[PDB]
Amino acid sequence: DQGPNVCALQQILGTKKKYFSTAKNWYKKSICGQKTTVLYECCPGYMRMEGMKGCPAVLPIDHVYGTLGIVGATTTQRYSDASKLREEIEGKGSFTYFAPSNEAWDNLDSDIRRGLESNVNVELLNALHSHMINKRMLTKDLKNGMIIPSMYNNLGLFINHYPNGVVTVNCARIIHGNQIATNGVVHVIDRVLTQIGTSIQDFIEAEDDLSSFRAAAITSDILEALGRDGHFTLFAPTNEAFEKLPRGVLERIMGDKVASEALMKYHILNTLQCSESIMGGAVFETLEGNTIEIGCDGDSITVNGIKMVNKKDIVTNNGVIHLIDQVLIPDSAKQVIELAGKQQTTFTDLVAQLGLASALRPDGEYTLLAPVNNAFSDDTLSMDQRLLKLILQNHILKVKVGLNELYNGQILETIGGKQLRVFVYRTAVCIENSCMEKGSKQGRNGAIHIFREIIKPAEKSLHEKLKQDKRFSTFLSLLEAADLKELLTQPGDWTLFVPTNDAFKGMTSEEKEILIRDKNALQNIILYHLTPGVFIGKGFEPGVTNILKTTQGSKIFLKEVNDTLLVNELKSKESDIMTTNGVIHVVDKLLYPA
C-alpha cells in the first residue's frame, strides 16, 4: 500500500495493458481514456518486516538467470534453461536481457512457439540472443533512435524513448525496467521480439491487402522514399479502406497528381510512434504538412478521433506501420464542398438539393461562403426554394479566394451575378451584412469560409432607404439641403447616423427655423452625422470605443456593447442597416461633436 520500496502494477480497465512502476505520490492519472486497477506489492528483491510499513528490507541481487525468475518471467527462464543460455547468463560478463513476460509468450504464434521448442540448441538460443545486449544498459541509457546490435548475428535492436517515459525495443514496451543483476540488467517487455522487416516499401509491395495503397504510391513516386533509411510511422489503409470510399472519389483523387501526392503524404509521419507510446491525445505533423490527431481509447488506437487501427506495430528497418480501416484524406486533396463540417451541413445540403452542387466543377476554382446551421431559421426555410436558391447563389464564388487573400474594400462576384463588399476590421472580417467565424479551410479546387448569418447583398442605396421611411423625412430634407443627395445616390462607402423625426420634434420645430437661418452651421451639424467608410457594430471588438473622424472632421465614438451600438455613449435604436453605398445607424437624438 504505502511505505518504502512499494511497487504498483497498474492495468488499464477493460484492457490487458500493464504498467509497472514504483509507488510514487501521483499516478492515479488515467491512461488512454480509462482508469486503472492497481496492484501493490514489494518491489522485486524487497521484503516486508514485522511492525514496519512498506518493505524496508532487501534481498541480495542474483545473476540475470535468477533475475528472470525474480522479475516474474518463468517462461523466459525455462527457454533460457532449455537452450543452455542459462550457463552464459549465470557466468562472467555483463548482459542486458529484454525478457518477454509469460503473457508475451502466450500471445506468440503457437506454431512459432512449438517451432522454437523444436530446436532448442540453435533457433531458440538465436531468438533469446536476439533479445539480449552484450553490456548492461539501463532504461536511461536506452536513447530514442538508438540501434543496438544484439547478441545474435548483430541483429539491430531499434530503441525508442518517449517523453512520457515509455521505452520500447522494436516497439515492444518495457513494462518492468531496470532489475539490477550481478551479471547485467533485466527488463520485462510486453511482446516477443520478431525478425525486422526489410523496409516499409518492401512490406507494402509484399502485402496484398495494401495492393490498392501500393498502386497509389507508385503514382505519386513516394514509394521509393519509403525504401530508404529513416524512422517513419505509416498508417496504411487496407483494400477495405479504399473500398469504403464514395464511388468515383478514389478515381478523381488518383487522376490528379497533386491530390494523390498530398493524400499519400498525409498517411506518413516523420518520426517513429509505437502504439505503446500513446497514452493519450497528441497532434503529429504528416509529410503533407497538415496534422493528424493520434490518441487511444482502451487498447484501440484512434486517428482523428476514429479508431481505424486493427493490426498495429508492424516494425520494419525504416519505421513502423499500423493498418487502418479508413483512408485519411487531407483538406488539400478534397473537393471544396467536401471541406464543410457539421455546422455547414444545412448549407452543404441546400446547395445539393437546389441544384448548385453539380455547378462546382473539379476543373474550376470556387469559394463557398457557408452560414452555420443556426443561421437558417424556420421562416428562412419556409420561403419558396427558388428564392432560397438565389440567396445561396450569393454564397458561392467562381474564383478561389483565401482568407489570407482578402482585403478591405474588395468586391467579390457571386455566381448569381451579384456583388459582395468586403469589410476588413482589426478583429473581424465582414462580407456585406455577415461576418466571418474561425474555421476557414482550403481544398484542392477551392476554399470555404464560415459565417454567422446569411449573406444578403443590400439592394437599396442610402437615399432610397432614407426616402422610404417617414420617420427620416425631415433629416432627408436637410441632407438634400446640404447638396448630399448626389452622394447618397451614387456608390461609395459611408457610415450615416440618421436621427428620427422624433429627435427634431424635441426642438418643437422652432429650432428648425432657428438653424434654418444658418447656412454654414447646418453644414457642420449635418456633416457630423456622416463618416467615410462603412463601420458596422458586428465588426467592432466588444467593449472597445472606436475613434472615427467624421467627414466634418470632429471625432465621433462608436462602442458596441451587448450587440448594441452606442454612438457617443448613446444607445442607437436600429443598428447595422445595410445599403449599397453605406450603412445606416438610427439614433434617438440629434448628434453634436461637443
User: Residue 333 class from Cβ within 10 Å (0-12 exposed, 13-18 middle, 19+ buried)?
Assistant: buried
User: Residue 343 class from Cβ within 10 Å (0-12 exposed, 13-18 middle, 19+ buried)?
Assistant: middle
The answer to whether 184 contacts Mg ion (rule: CB under 5 A) is: no
DSSP 478-512: HHHHTT-HHHHHS---EEEEEE-HHHHHTTTTHHH
Given Ca ion, Na ion, Mg ion, none, residue 60, with its beta carbon under 5 to 8 Å by kind, binds Na ion
Stretch that binds a copy of itself, among 164-172, 177-185, 379-387, 462-470 (CB under 8 A): 177-185
3-state SS assignment for residue 198: coil
Nearer Cβ to a copy of itself, position 119 or 427? Answer: 427
Q: How far is CA 358 from the centre of its chain?
A: 29
Half-sphere CA count of 289, side-chain side, radius 13 A: 5
The answer to whether 60 contacts Na ion (rule: CB under 5 A) is: yes
The answer to whether 407 contacts a copy of itself (rule: CB under 8 A) is: yes
* Residue 383 grid coordinates: 420561403
Residues comprising the chain, all counted: 594
Stretch that binds Na ion, among 53-61, 95-103, 444-452, 483-491 (CB under 5 A): 53-61
Nearer Cβ to Cl ion, position 21 or 107? Answer: 21
Nearer Cβ to Ca ion, position 371 or 539? Answer: 539
Given Na ion, Ca ion, Zn ion, none, residue 246, with its beta carbon under 5 to 8 Å by kind, binds none
The answer to whether 58 contacts a copy of itself (rule: CB under 8 A) is: yes
The answer to whether 53 contacts a copy of itself (rule: CB under 8 A) is: no
The answer to whether 404 contacts a copy of itself (rule: CB under 8 A) is: yes
C-beta of residue 32 within 8 angstroms of C-beta of residue 309: no
The answer to whether 273 contacts Cl ion (rule: CB under 5 A) is: no
Half-sphere CA count of 353, side-chain side, radius 13 A: 12
Half-sphere CA count of 144, side-chain side, radius 13 A: 12
The answer to whether 425 contacts Na ion (rule: CB under 5 A) is: yes
Pick from 35, 53, 114, 140 the residue near Ca ion by CB under 5 A.
140
* Residue 581 grid coordinates: 453605398
Taking the C-alpha atoms of residue 374 and residue 452, their distance in angstroms, rounded to an integer, is 8
Pick from 69, 416, 492, 533 the residue near Ca ion by CB under 5 A.
533
* Residue 149 grid coordinates: 546490435
The answer to whether 63 contacts Ca ion (rule: CB under 5 A) is: no
What minimum distance in Å lies between the beta carbon of 426 and Na ion?
6
Strands (E), 46-126: 46-47, 57-58, 95-100
Nearer Cβ to Mg ion, position 181 or 287? Answer: 181
Pick from 3, 93, 416, 492 the residue near a copy of itself by CB under 8 A.
93
3-state SS assignment for residue 310: coil
Given Zn ion, a copy of itself, Ca ion, none, residue 58, with its beta carbon under 5 to 8 Å by kind, binds a copy of itself
What minimum distance in Å lies between the beta carbon of 9 and Ca ion?
6
C-beta of residue 393 within 8 angstroms of C-beta of residue 415: yes
Which residues contact a copy of itself (rule: CB under 8 A)? Answer: 4-5, 45, 47, 49, 56-61, 92-94, 135-137, 141, 180, 182-184, 402, 404-410, 424-427, 533, 535, 541, 543-548, 557
Which residues contact Ca ion (rule: CB under 5 A)? Answer: 20, 139-140, 175-176, 423, 533
